[PDB]
Amino acid sequence: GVDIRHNKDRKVRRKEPKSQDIYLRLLVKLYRFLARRTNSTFNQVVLKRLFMSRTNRPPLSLSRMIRKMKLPGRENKTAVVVGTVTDDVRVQEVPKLKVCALRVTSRARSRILKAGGKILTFDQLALDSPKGRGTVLLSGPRKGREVYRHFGKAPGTPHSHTKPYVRSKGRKFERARGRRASRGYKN
Template identity: 90%
Template sequence: DKIRNINHNLDLINVRRKEPKSQDIYLRLLVKLYRFLARRTNSTFNQVVLKRLFMSRTNRPPLSLSRMIRKMKLPGRENKTAVVVGTITDDVRVQEVPKLKVCALRILRAGGKIFTFDQLALDSPKGCGTVLLSGPRRGREVYRHFGTAPGTPHSHTKPYVRSKGRKFERARGRRASRGYKN
């Protein structure tokens, strides 16, 4: 009887989405379009857009208007189209929005020239004159709880506590007068 060494750590290597999880027919149409473009054009832009269309909601984080403006002000990005596979959210802190060309899945309350992805495919099928942007992936609050365990030295990980009162994870390890300070 042979002893097999089955390493299940390698199972996750081939896990990649071949299609979106969502049943949204409009998203499925975009996938059809970009599948065609990724296959028939030799541009990596279309392959990246296709891959991002498959992504889960948490991997398509929203991009704020202010961050997009900041990224589009960088040198060499004038007159280019900002492409975001995700949502662009309004930012009330922005007083005046410069003239921008934007393509995104969802745009909430913004002026300027706005494309949808099918219009972008007509406008620049190979992704010429575009800047691919994405929101901060680790921007969600849940990431503050990840890392070395709270309470260990030099850990800034946020503990899950039921209350933020005086008695809850505020004494030992948090201040020198109560035993020790981490």
């Protein structure tokens, strides 16, 4: 025979989205072409990011967009998001932004446009810049989800600040034998 191990023989990654959305698949049909037929790897990253799941493309907020476009050097560039540019109400003055996301929520659209900005989609993005140059690609906060407060080294195991699955935060609900030192032992 041959002594291969066939355990990891299959790459797990996505070839296509698991959505039957049709505007998303037409964006896929455009970026399959641009990634297959340009040499720029922005199109391969945008192809792989249109492929992803809702929890793999998290929404960055307008505050992250403001800060990460105010980093010096990338003036009058084009922010490129594959998730959702949501509004962030704890910012007041918004600069002129040139954004490109799949979906921008309503008051964030009003905010950017009356700041004086311009909101593109990916089709007119690819008409504006096919190799995608002059673009700052950005991502949402991906460990921002609350399900990551439960992940990692278990609770009840020292040096591990993992939130446990408790049906109610209270006084009687997991405070006693592993948490105290007067009751039992502390970790």
